[PDB]
């Protein structure tokens, strides 16, 4: 039946992507109810990125200085505020395409779907993960600021990510929908250390379980490890330590497939110290880490979101 | 700015995914205007897959024997016909969410976005490619028949794929929207040879150009090849022969980046005979082949579809 990096259907989010232009800079906004959410750096200019006094810069801005454009119907702002690193612009009308929504601050290792947008128009959707150092690698060209990451819980859209900036290292950073950055990043153009990044071990094991369900089983062995033994191998290869909670999350995959979690760990232990030896695991010769154990269950069971 | 397997925004397609149930079997349909398109094997049963007489089976079926369900509004069929391997059911009402659409029979090597559906409800979207042997690897669980692949040309949705069956080899086959299968496949459950599969060489080179734009340039060398010399290496590694047309399609990427096409070919020639030696190319140690040269341009320029 096969397995893939699946992205949520982006229909419910496309109807909220608007275009926010403040004087010089243009970027994307999120129109829910009668409010538009956008990155607060839309009020800056090119030179302002070096060191922005956002409170004084916003003071210079009036309501009519904000031009919000949803397709071809232009929205009248009548209120504005700065919550952390985002703007909250009250507009004339409620978004009639507003879905049921939850603002959620997700955790590292969690995955979500990103809808890349430019001047308020959708371009593409893909699945990525919040890396342990609170970065996400991205496909964010010039003017993609304000793109949103999200999950969908059956009928509700859980907004978690808003893309702000791009680091000089090439990876990207953003906030939740309340403006607080993920990680130590601030919205200015300075040298911003990404910090060391490890591999989400829970995601790697759940990915191995999915491969067992979809044909590839050459890595299965009849050697074990203990939780402490596998851990001493994990940090030598810069893998996250595996708590008992991570074992319990893998419980459903452990039962349906009949391989104990620690049996999967020793397969991973053997893959770290000996590589893959030319073979692959579902079309990839790398240890994929952007699949949560929940994501594996949706793809192997067939959970729908409408 | 990074690069990824991007999928088209699936909003315009979500509004057409309906549920078609005929007696025993349930699968997905495509509701455009006043017509529902679905795989013709919905009128079969479990045993009928061995050898179906579709013309005699459809004769036993009447209009009321077809239950089309769009969310919670049930559609009245008033006409039915069998065009090749698909059904055409005229319904009571036009789909008010119908987009501008083109039915297109795509070619091997071309890519498109698939919206996986179950009982008529969307589940996920991802980008795949029509392999040279007219197969696509898939993530198609039980009841995903009728899922559609599509491209979007700025404002028009080009429907190209409809998933029918799953081969015993694990890969999948389908038709266009006129019912003609891609490849030699027929809609019955028998041993169906997938045929040999090669690697889309044009896609691999365009993928290398994208990596040059996004940081990774370690594979760039100051050795060349000729078109005939690279070809003798290509078929030894089961790669498609490179025509002059394939060189010309890579023209825009060749100019913007300043590396001649044949210079990229010798980098590929060197990657085939010596592997990757531990290094990667945009987070992958495999020669990706599901990126058309057009796809590379959209992601590096920022083309929008609304």
Author numbering:
A (entry chain A), B (entry chain A): 1 to 306
Quote the authors verbatim.
SARS-CoV-2 Mpro is a cysteine protease that forms a dimer composed of two protomers. Each protomer comprises the chymotrypsin and 3C-like peptidase domains I and II (residues 10–99 and 100–182, respectively), with the active site consisting of a Cys145-His41 catalytic dyad located in the cleft between the two antiparallel-β-barrel domains. Mpro cleaves the polyproteins at 11 positions with a consensus cleavage sequence Leu Gln | (Ser, Ala, Gly) to release nsp’s, which are required to assemble the viral replication-transcription complex. In addition to the indispensable role in viral replication, SARS-CoV-2 Mpro also plays an essential role in escaping antiviral defense by cleaving host cell proteins.
